[PDB]
Structure formats: C-alpha cells, structure tokens
From Swiss-Prot, chains A, B, C, D, E, F, G:
Induction (record text): 24-fold increase in transcription in response to iron treatment.
Residue sites binding K(+) per the record: 148, 151
Inactivation phenotype: No growth phenotype in iron-sufficient conditions, cells do not store detectable iron under any conditions tested, cells secrete less pyoverdin siderophore and deplete iron from the medium slowly. Very low amounts of FtnA-only BFR complexes accumulate in vivo at low O(2) levels.
Organism for this UniProt entry: Pseudomonas aeruginosa (strain ATCC 15692 / DSM 22644 / CIP 104116 / JCM 14847 / LMG 12228 / 1C / PRS 101 / PAO1)
Outcome, altering residue 34 to F: About 30% active in Fe(2+) oxidation and storage, diiron-binding site does not coordinate fully, decreased overall flexibility of the BFR, partially occludes B-pores, see Fe ion inside the B-pore
Gene Ontology CC terms, in alphabetical order: cytosol; ferritin complex
UniProt name for this protein: Bacterioferritin BfrB
Effect of residue 85 to A: Assembles into normal BFR with wild-type ability to oxidize Fe(2+) and store Fe(3+), 5.5-fold decrease in rate of iron release from BRF, greatly reduced affinity for Bfd
GO MF term set: ferric iron binding; ferroxidase activity; heme binding; iron ion binding; iron ion sequestering activity
Gene: bfrB
C-alpha cells in the first residue's frame, strides 16, 4: 500500500533511533555483566530486546507502505563509562527518541495515517516507561547512595 | 434497627478518619512506587486497602442503624515530602484515629451497643498493628541509617 | 519526566471526578445492599472499584509527570433517596465526567502528550460503558415497571 | 452438474428470504441487547446465525448446480419498534419464507431434484421451529403480561 | 447517549461498506470452494467473518448513540470471474473502505467522539491487514506463477 | 585479564562482520515475509538471530580481555532486490566473514590465545553451515526452477 | 598408548597446579564459612570441586599415556588473611596456571598430541572463567566498598 513519503521518512528516523538504542543498551548490558552488576545487566538486556521488537515493527510497517527500511546509517552511540553515566546516556537517548516520536505522530495525523500513528503511540508508551525506569534509578542513586545502589544490583 | 444518635455520630467520625487514611496512604504508596521504593509502596498500598475495608464496615453498620454515612466531608491529609516525614505523618494520623476509636468505644459501651463496640475494637486492633509497624520503621531508620533503610525497601 | 502544567491540571480535574464517583457509587452500593437489592449493590460496588482503578492510573501518571496529585479536594456527592434517583445521580455525574474527559483529551493532543491522551481515552471508554448501563437501567424501569425492576435486582 | 433453471430461481428466492432474515434478526438482537433485554438478544442472535447457515447451504447448492447465487438483491427488512412488533415482524417474515419453501419443494419434486428438495425440507423444518418459538412468545406476552414477559428476558 | 448526527452518518457509511464486504467475501469463498481451491475458500471465509464482527460493533455503537443502523441499503458487490479478479475486486473494495474510514475518523476527531474514533481505528487496522494479504497474494501470483499459486491453494 | 591488542582488533573485525550480517539478514527476512515467502522469512530470521548470538559472545570476550567492543562502525549492507540476489548477497558476506575468521584464528594461535581461537572456531563452524545452506538454496533454484523454489517457501 | 615424555611432564605440572588450587580453594571456602561469609564459602567450595574434576581428567590422561601421575609433590599454597587477599591469592595462582597451560598446549601441538591439547584447552577455558570471576569480585570491592561487599556474601 503506497504510503506518504514523509511518513516513511519519519518511520525511518524512528527506526534509526531504535537501532542506536539496541546497540547502546546491548553494550551497557554486557558492560554491567562484566562488572558483576548482573541485575543491571539483565534489565538492560531486556531493554535492548524491547528496542529490537520496536525496530522489527517499524521495518515491517515501512515495507508494507512500499518504502525502503534504512538499517545502514547508524547514528552516534552514547556509551557511558560508569553506572550513573550509562543511565544518563540512556535517558538522553530516550528523550531524543520521544521528541522524534511526537513529531512523527503529528505528521501521521495530518496525512491521516492513523495506523502508523497507533504504532508510534505504542512505541512512545514503551519509551516513556523506559524514561520512568531511568529517572527512578538515577533518583535511587541519590537516595540510597551509589555504593548501596550498586550493591543492590549485583545479584539478579 | 434504629441506632443511638451519638453512636452514629461517633461512627461517622471514625469513618471520616478512615477516609483521610485511605487517601493519605494511597498517595504515599504511589509516591514510594514512583521513587522506586517498591517495598514501602506495596506495604503502604496494603495499609490503604485495610482502611478501605474498615470504612466499608463502618458504612454498612451506620446504614443498618438507620443513619446517613458521611462520605462528603474529607479532613486534612498529612502528606510528607520524604520517607521519614511520610512515616511520621502516617503515625500522627493513626494516633489521632486511636484516640477517636477509644472515645467511640466508651460511648457504645454506655448505650449498650455492644456490636458496634466489637467492630470498633477490631478496627482498633488493626490501627495498633499499623502503629507498631510505623514506630518500628522509624526506629529502624535510626538503627541501620536512612540510606540502608531505603535500600532495603527498593525491591519487593 | 516534566509534564505540561495544564495537562497535570486536567489530570487532577479528572481525578477529582473519579474521587467523587468512588464515594458516590460505594455509598449507593451499600444502600442498595442494606435495602435487600443485592444485585444492584454488587453491580454498583464493581462500578466503584472500576473508578478506584482509574484514579490509581491517574495518580501514577501525575507523579510520573512530576505533578502533585490532589486527593484533598472532594466535590459534591450526588446521593439519591430511591433507586430511580440514585441511577439518575450516577448518570448526571458520568455526563459531567465525560465532558471533562473530552476537554482533557483535546488539550493532551494540542501539547502532543499522546500517552496521557491514550490513558484518558481508555477511561472515557469505561465511562461510556457505565453511561450505557445507567441509561439502560432507567429504560428498563419504564418497560418492566419499577416493582418488577426492583424484584429482578433483589438476588445477586 | 447443470441444474434446472427454475430450481435455481427458486433457490435464489429462498436465499433472498434468508438474507433479509439474517439482517432483520441481527438488528433485532442488537436492539434488544441495547435495551437490556439480553435473553431476547441472545436468542435472536442465534436465530440470525441459523439463517446464515441456511444461506451458506443454499449458496453452495446453487454453485454446484452451476447457477449464480444472488447476494445483491436485498428485499425489505421488517423492523419493529418494540418487542411485540419485533416478534410479529419476525413471524410475518417466517410465514412468507415457509410459503416460498413449499412452492420450491413442489417444483423440485416435479423435476426430480430430490437432493434440492431434501435441503429445502431441512430448512423448512428449522423455519417451522422458529415459528413455534415466535408464536409461543406472543402467546406468553398475553398470558403473563408484557411487563412480566420483558422482566423474564432481561438476564440470560 | 445522543451522538453527533454526522458521526452516525459516517458510521452507517462504514457499516454499508462492511455489509458489501461480508457478502462479496462470502460468495468469493464459496466460489473458491466449489472450484476446489479450498485454502483460498477457507481464508476468504475468515475474511467474511471478520467483516461480520466489524459490522456487529458498528451496529452496537450506532444504537448506543441513539441512531438507526442501516442494514437495508446494500451497495454494489464486486464479484470476479477468476481468482486474480476476485482478489483485485476485494482489494478495490478495501481501498474504498479505508478511504471512508479515514474521512470518518477526521470527523470523529473534530467533534471529540474519541470512542467512535478508536473503534474506527481498530477496524482500519484490520482492513490494512486485509490489504496487505491481498497485495501479497497478487504479488505471489507473479512470483510463483498462476498455476503454482492455484496449486498451493487447493488443499487446506 | 588484559588481552593481546591485535587479538582484540581481530575480534572487533569479526564483530563488525556479524553486525553487518545481523541487519542484512533481518532486512532480507522481513522482505521475504512482506512478499509472502514466509518459510524463507522464518529461516532468514533464524540466521539473523544466530549472528546476534555470535555478536554477543564476541562482545563478552572483548570485554573480558579489557578491550572496547566496536558497535559504532557499521560496514556496507548487501541488500538484494530479488530472492536469488538476496541469497548471493548473504553468501558473499559469509565468504568475507570466513576469510576474516581464518586470519584471526592464525593470530590467536601465534600469541597462544587458545580460548579466543576456540570461540572463533565455533563461529566458523556456524558460518560454514550457513554457507552450505546458501549454496544449497542457489543450487535448488537451478534444479527445480525459481517459481517452484518460491512456491515451496510460501508457507512455514 | 605410550605418550610423549615431555607431554607427560607438562601434564604432571598442570596436575601439580590443580592440586595446589584444590587445597587452597577448599581452605579459603572453609575460612569464609567460619567467618559467616557463606556465599563466598559456597562459591569457593564449587571452585575447589571444579579443580578436583580437572585433576581427575589429568590423572586419567597421564595413566592412559603410560606415565605416573604425581600426587606426591604439593607446591606452595597461597592462603590469604582477609577476603581481599584470599581472592588475590586465588587470582595469582590462576594466572600462573594459565601460563603453564599455554606452554603445555604449545608442546602438545608440536608433537601432534591433539587430544591432550583439547583437554588442556577445556581446562584453560575453565580457568579463564575463574579469573573472570575473581577480577570481577576484586572490582566489586572497589565499587560497592568492602563492608557492602562482605555484607552481600553473608547469606547464600
Ligand atoms: C548489536 C546488535 C544486536 C545484538 C547484539 C542482538 C542480540 C540479540 C539476542 C542475544 C537475542 C536473543 C536470542 C536468543 O537467545 O533467543 C536477540 C533477539 C532478537 N533480536 Fe536482536 N540483537 C541485535 C540486533 C537486532 C536488530 C538490529 C534487530 C531488528 C532489526 C533485532 C531483532 C531481534 C528480535 C525480533 C529478537 C527476538 C526477541 C524475542 O522475541 O525474544 N536484533 N537479539
Ligand atoms: C470511600 C472510599 C473507599 C472505599 C470505601 C473503598 C473500598 C474498597 C474495597 C472494599 C476494596 C476491595 C478490597 C478487597 O478486595 O478485599 C477496594 C479496592 C481497591 N481500592 Fe478502594 N475504596 C475507597 C477509595 C479508594 C481510593 C480513593 C482509591 C484510589 C486509588 C482506591 C483504590 C483501590 C484499588 C486500586 C483497589 C484494588 C481493586 C482491584 O484491583 O481489585 N480506593 N476499595
Ligand atoms: C448483517 C450481516 C451479518 C452480520 C452482522 C453477521 C454476524 C455474524 C457474527 C457476529 C458471527 C459470529 C462470528 C464469531 O464467530 O464470533 C457470524 C457467523 C457466521 N456468519 Fe454471519 N453475519 C452477517 C451476514 C452473513 C451472511 C450474509 C452469511 C452467508 C451469506 C453469513 C454466514 C455466517 C456463518 C456461516 C457463520 C458461522 C456460523 C457457525 O458458527 O457455524 N453471515 N455472523
Ligand atoms: C583437602 C583435600 C580435599 C578435600 C577437603 C575434598 C573434599 C571433597 C568433598 C567434600 C567432595 C564432595 C563430597 C560429597 O558430598 O559427595 C569432593 C568431591 C570430589 N573430589 Fe575432593 N577433596 C579433596 C581433594 C581431592 C583431590 C586431591 C582429588 C583428585 C585428585 C579430588 C577429587 C574429587 C572428585 C572427583 C569429587 C567428585 C565431585 C563430583 O563431581 O560430584 N578431591 N571432594
Ligand atoms: O456522604 C453522604 N452520605 C449521605 O447519606 C449523603 C446524602 N444523603 C441524601 C439523603 C438520602 C436519604 Br435515603 C435520606 C436523606 C438524605 O439527605 C447527600 C449528600 C452526601 C451524603
Ligand atoms: O492531595 C494532596 N496531594 C499532594 O501532593 C498533597 C500535599 N503535598 C505535600 C508535598 C509533597 C511534596 Br514531595 C512536595 C510538595 C508538597 O506540597 C499536601 C496536602 C495534600 C496533598
Ligand atoms: O450477487 C451476486 N451473485 C453473483 O454471482 C454475482 C455476480 N456474478 C459475477 C459473475 C461471475 C461469473 Br464466474 C460469471 C458471470 C458473472 O456475472 C456479479 C454481481 C453480483 C452477484
Ligand atoms: O436497516 C434498517 N435499520 C433500521 O433501524 C430500520 C428500520 N427501523 C424501524 C424503526 C425502529 C425504531 Br426503535 C425507531 C424508528 C424506526 O424507523 C426500518 C427498516 C429498515 C431499517
Ligand atoms: O561502539 C562502541 N563501543 C564502545 O565501547 C564505545 C564507546 N565507549 C566509551 C569508552 C571510551 C574509551 Br577511550 C574507554 C572506555 C570507554 O568505555 C563509546 C562510543 C561507541 C562505542
Ligand atoms: O604421586 C605418585 N604417583 C605415583 O604413581 C607414585 C608412586 N608409584 C610407584 C610406581 C607404580 C608403578 Br604401577 C610403576 C612405577 C612406580 O614407580 C609412588 C609414590 C608416589 C607416587
Ligand atoms: K548496605
Ligand atoms: K413479576
Ligand atoms: Na520516577
Ligand atoms: Na532495581
Ligand atoms: Na521492611
Ligand atoms: Na436493612
Ligand atoms: Na441502552
Ligand atoms: Na440487571
Ligand atoms: Na424465554
Ligand atoms: Na465444482
Ligand atoms: Na505485502
Ligand atoms: Na497462502
Ligand atoms: Na527449504
Ligand atoms: Na570482569
Ligand atoms: Na556475589
């Protein structure tokens, strides 16, 4: 079904954000596991898988609309070097991702692509859940202290 | 069955205290959950449900006694700004509530409304259990430190 | 995640309506049980629980958006004196609720808070189901007669 | 297998009656459900489904006999404005349907299409059962009164 | 609950499209079965049932909104004479249906009938899934050839 | 445990090939699914997952050796426009990957990193299985013809 | 089957290292249990058993190759005096073990004793896993602090 060219461009932009997030979260997961923070490692692994599932749905939608999914142009990964910075890097990425999701939804609404809008709304709900998790973890570091926060994430 | 007018007034006063407690405990529960202190959030949620069940019984008793349950007047919620204050706000409310329960029981006894006394005694037992929990949490903060206390309430 | 101030005010307004409905439906439920109309009491009890669940979701969203949920202000309960009036009181409350939900959704759309819109739309779907239930009960009273209508709601 | 041209015309007339009945019974079902007469709504839904099954068999037989099943020409639906009228509308349709079935069977017998006759006989047995149901309900309205009759069909 | 007059007109227009699709798909299903292409026949039967379920939901919504569901006016069925035409006839009908769904959603949004919009959006998702299936079948006829494509749809 | 710098560079080169293959095979999978060739889509999906698992093991090994896994550089994806070209693009990538695996094993052996050698040997075994699959599919297309080959990959 | 003399000497050197590790890890295990650090005690017990299993396989190989397994000569145990030192003592022993394994594999390869090489490679993989565990524990001490680290290893 021929889709709106600019909708397809938005979908490819959201896809690109998901492709960044997949790799950033996967690497953060394996860094945390390497450091013995296996509860963080496991949670971040599931965050990466969730992004993989969003990217799948976006690829499938682009193809149905007769566009070409762009899996080639990988943007900048935000890789932290300590737990607090890794969480902040994930949060910064998610905040960019939700800004792009909102702009894409606006355009879907204007050209009446209501199914594309609904997919993007579902993705946006998942990313706002991720923002909640991230903001909460950063708050917990402040409340319980870094050493306790890390201690509580050693064991899965 | 026509009940004593002042018994009904006493029951409506206890119900008013329970209505405050429901909302105060529910809000504290959701604040703790938002902050990631999910063991506190869950325990406080169960406190709120317990007050809901007490309010239900009071409403049912008032109607059997041919009175009008007062769900319209809501007194002042005591909302803390951090974990220590929230626990103290709950404890301050509970101590007011047990004072009012004791005065209500005195009056039921004097007009021979022994069934209402028995209900109020059961509610009082629950409120004293809640006081014990609250006093114990405040003591633990002193014994293990606030940071450890909070750490121990992150995970259910 | 910092939300739009006016979204939060709308969410608190909706929460305010839900808090009225919780108490109004709970009281109506217990009145109907006291009168031996236990099928009405059970159904109205589940309406009250449904509003509690909506209130929970709203409180949770407000906190995520870094607002203060308002559980302190309780508006006017509409309590009937007989079954027909109680049903009409519930219907009047629900018509106000859905008007306010629609205005809140307009605003969420304008500021691109698509997740708050989606929550409010789900609540609106539940309230329209409640409106259908209430309109249908008032119509059944006309079709079968008040005495038959009440008879059919004696046993659960 | 080439069928008799007039048999196929008869089968298409029967099919035409079933297509009216499907829609008429389906709309009546959903009207009764909307009014809270769920027992009537459920029963009328099952009547609609049964006519769908008859239409299916007629379509299949016509195609086997190398005719064109007419799903395009929808005759007049008889929709009532209250329960008694809806039942009477269904009954009037059924009495027309059984008259056309009998005429179709006469012709099948004359041209030795005994398999088409057997199918129409089975459909006719179903339609006479539906007539029994409808006549019985109209008789019950008189025997128990309309208010009781409707009361007995509120709940499934 | 009194609905917007033009919403109701749009819902009846969507319903009319569904009623065409029910009959068109059912007839195509039974033609394919008659030809021994039972896998196509079974799939097309399920498409017809899906349209039956959408029609049901639209009828229910129109009645709740105090409108009259139009099951009397049946538009033009697009019936093909071979597999390739039957699939293209279904796709042509689906593309008109989605145009009409988009225009209905625009109006629902303008008058704040967000629950009707949500219903139409769900139906639109189902119709886009049907378009995907249909476009894919026409593409497979090209990629595997017509004889293979038909061969692969003989047996369930 | 600090690893040999050139081993880590080889591991990152292998990881780079796996990252290309993940995306290429995932896109090919979803292209085949969009075209209705779901058996090809499923098989190619499982090849993508396999490469994901290889990439995971490489990331973990590089971190253990105190290197930085390179998930930022993505080389050129080879995306075909039809089934034969897609298979040949996968085969070309695999043949580059196995060449690079062999050079890396030579260097692991020279510096006595026998565990890295063993991991790369296991990956090489998987890639030679993939080469077998691809070469075999290309041979089958020649033996049974493209139309039959695609027909046999329509259904899982 | 008569083995290479120097291969057997290498196997006996590896066995010598395993015999040290068995005793060193078993004593550290029982020290940690005595101190109430039972999670460390259990984990170190399992490391000791793993070394027992490697020693068994080496003894079995030496005897097959017609050599005499040396269980008489026990080298210097590295026993720590606190948790940090004990983990470091284990790590120091493991790093010497892996050096000796690599040198043994070199010789096995040169004289074509590929089965002995394979056994030593499997042991080497286990010892590198043990090095990963130890380095990770020493890193956790730095990140969570010694008091938290020990706290986390009190209970199993
Ligand atoms: C650094 C790149 C990637 C890594 C390291 C990676 C890793 C993984 C792993 C380890 C799994 C679990 C497999 C299993 O054990 O069953 C997985 C699953 C999956 N991946 Fe990836 N992946 C990557 C990229 C992608 C991309 C780019 C996509 C889509 C475009 C994707 C889509 C999926 C899907 C759909 C699943 C299945 C999840 C489920 O339902 O359980 N992945 N990935
Ligand atoms: C007059 C005030 C209230 C009364 C009398 C009341 C009563 C009840 C009762 C009897 C229950 C079921 C307990 C059980 O299953 O044993 C319940 C459940 C619940 N209440 Fe309330 N309640 C009130 C107010 C509230 C408020 C203001 C909230 C705010 C969120 C709330 C949230 C809940 C929730 C989330 C449940 C669980 C429902 C479920 O998932 O089953 N309640 N309430
Ligand atoms: C107003 C038009 C129609 C409506 C609203 C309607 C509605 C329905 C519904 C809701 C179902 C059950 C779906 C489920 O399983 O949940 C159904 C089943 C069915 N319909 Fe229809 N339908 C319509 C027209 C037709 C027509 C015209 C035919 C044949 C030409 C037909 C044949 C069938 C059959 C064979 C079944 C399955 C019966 C069984 O359970 O064995 N329907 N219909
Ligand atoms: C201080 C010296 C040692 C101690 C305290 C020790 C202790 C133990 C214990 C407690 C068990 C498990 C007993 C059970 O509950 O079944 C065990 C198992 C075993 N030990 Fe030792 N051991 C020592 C030395 C050795 C040596 C020198 C060897 C071989 C060279 C060895 C080989 C084994 C084997 C093969 C097992 C079987 C465990 C399994 O796979 O289930 N041990 N040892
Ligand atoms: O919280 C409240 N509890 C109440 O009973 C109530 C109200 N009662 C209405 C009423 C009902 C009867 Br039957 C007889 C007299 C009468 O005034 C009105 C507003 C708020 C409340
Ligand atoms: O219903 C109510 N919801 C509320 O948030 C609330 C109150 N807030 C206390 C508070 C908490 C924080 Br943290 C930051 C500021 C602040 O004022 C007080 C009374 C009643 C209510
Ligand atoms: O209700 C209807 N039943 C029908 O068969 C039908 C139509 N048939 C199309 C057709 C198919 C073939 Br193969 C050969 C001739 C032919 O006309 C067209 C419109 C409406 C209907
Ligand atoms: O397709 C049709 N949908 C309909 O509602 C309908 C008809 N309705 C009769 C009716 C019922 C009521 Br209650 C109120 C007004 C009213 O006119 C009659 C013929 C055909 C149709
Ligand atoms: O693909 C990537 N793999 C990575 O490790 C990585 C990054 N690492 C940050 C980093 C840099 C240095 Br210098 C030392 C330690 C360190 O953690 C940053 C961007 C992209 C990537
Ligand atoms: O650790 C030890 N391993 C051993 O095999 C061993 C000993 N074996 C004596 C022996 C047995 C045979 Br059969 C053939 C030759 C031979 O000298 C004696 C003392 C200590 C050890
Ligand atoms: K601690
Ligand atoms: K009666
Ligand atoms: Na939070
Ligand atoms: Na956590
Ligand atoms: Na506790
Ligand atoms: Na009573
Ligand atoms: Na109704
Ligand atoms: Na009822
Ligand atoms: Na009946
Ligand atoms: Na045939
Ligand atoms: Na397609
Ligand atoms: Na198929
Ligand atoms: Na195959
Ligand atoms: Na490590
Ligand atoms: Na540990």
């Amino acid at each position: 079904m021929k889709g709106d060219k600019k909708v397809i461009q938005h979908l490819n932009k959201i896809l690109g954000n998901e492709l960044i997030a997949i790799n950033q979260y996967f690497l953060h997961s394996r860094m945390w596991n390497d450091w013995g923070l296996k509860r963080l490692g496991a949670h971040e692994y599931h965050e990466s898988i969730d992004e993989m599932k969003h990217a799948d749905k976006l690829i499938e939608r682009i193809l149905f609309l007769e566009g070409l999914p762009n899996l080639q142009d990988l943007g900048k990964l935000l890789i932290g070097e300590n737990t607090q910075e890794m969480l902040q890097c994930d949060l910064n990425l998610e905040l960019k991702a939700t800004k792009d999701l909102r702009e894409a939804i606006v355009h879907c609404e204007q050209v009446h692509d209501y199914v594309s809008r609904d997919l993007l709304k579902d993705i946006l709900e998942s990313e706002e859940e991720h923002i909640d998790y991230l903001e909460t973890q950063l708050g917990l570091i402040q409340k319980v202290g870094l050493e306790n926060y890390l201690q509580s994430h050693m064991h899965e």
